Write a protein that binds this ligand. Structure first.
Ligand SMILES: CC1(C)S[C@@H]2[C@H](NC(=O)[C@H](N)c3ccccc3)C(=O)N2[C@H]1C(=O)O
Ligand SMILES: CC1(C)S[C@@H]2[C@H](NC(=O)[C@H](N)c3ccccc3)C(=O)N2[C@H]1C(=O)O
Lengths: 137, 136
């Protein structure tokens, strides 16, 4: 009833841990950090503003500022207000899926594609419910 | 075909972080710490740990992990090869209070079975994730 909340963290931790390690070279190659990486990954979803990102990421605005501009100067992300991704930046996310998806399907090769559908419905509804709530002051 | 599920997992995660980060903002303020320092306490809510450990699981900059630790010593939410404290134990309680109270309200309409079935598919995936990781 609550070690679900504890499992979630752990589970999230573990994913983070594995992803960081998995994407170690792909980042060094583009000379980016793990967060420069995320923001990048966090931007494949929607166009944000340094404010939108600091909030969404819960950290110091100052930090979010450089990580951000360091991406402009490296031509990975671009402008309009409205921070979007540059094609170089895309090739990156492409090589991110490319890696993620390979090890991802290994651990999922024997899943009841239907049992998974049901699982996603629940998570999707929880996802929807999280976004919903997230808005309110 | 499977790429779809991944995109979701990431978003679902992103949203969890956003939410937790939004819900704890004031508490991390009320005590006077940054999320960074706050994540440290949570990895200690579960157990103990030295430097190389906390520096490895998160895995971030050797120094970074160090500098936040030393700050956590001053507020005394961490005892020294690093544990929690009376004040430390207290923060988490409060942290857990909010979280659960929301997740519950946000899930207290689901079918006991539906949920568990989720936990089990997530447990096996974590199990594999971990095993794969351990292969350095
Ligand atoms: C390539 C990535 C490492 S970037 C994205 C994010 N990485 C982070 O470091 C993120 N800022 C974070 C992690 C943990 C606590 C707080 C913040 C994550 O998860 N990521 C991988 C992805 O792209 O799938
Ligand atoms: C030392 C750095 C982390 S900050 C420096 C500058 N980037 C900035 O955003 C600028 N300093 C600044 C503006 C606002 C808030 C915080 C920082 C630059 O380039 N940088 C980094 C580096 O040398 O790696």
């Amino acid at each position: 009833i609550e070690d679900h909340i504890s499992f979630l963290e752990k589970f999230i931790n573990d994913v983070n841990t594995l992803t960081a390690k998995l994407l170690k070279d792909l980042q060094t190659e583009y000379g980016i950090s793990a967060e420069q990486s995320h923001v990048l990954n966090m931007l494949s979803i929607e166009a944000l503003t340094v404010g939108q990102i600091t909030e969404k990421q819960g950290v110091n605005k100052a930090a979010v500022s450089r990580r951000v501009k360091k991406l402009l100067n490296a031509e990975l992300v671009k402008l309009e207000k409205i921070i979007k991704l540059s094609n170089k930046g895309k090739k990156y996310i492409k090589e991110r899926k490319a890696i993620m998806s390979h090890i991802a399907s290994d651990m999922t090769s024997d899943f009841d594609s239907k049992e998974i559908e049901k699982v996603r419905q629940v998570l999707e509804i929880i996802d929807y419910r999280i976004q919903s709530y997230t808005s309110k002051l």
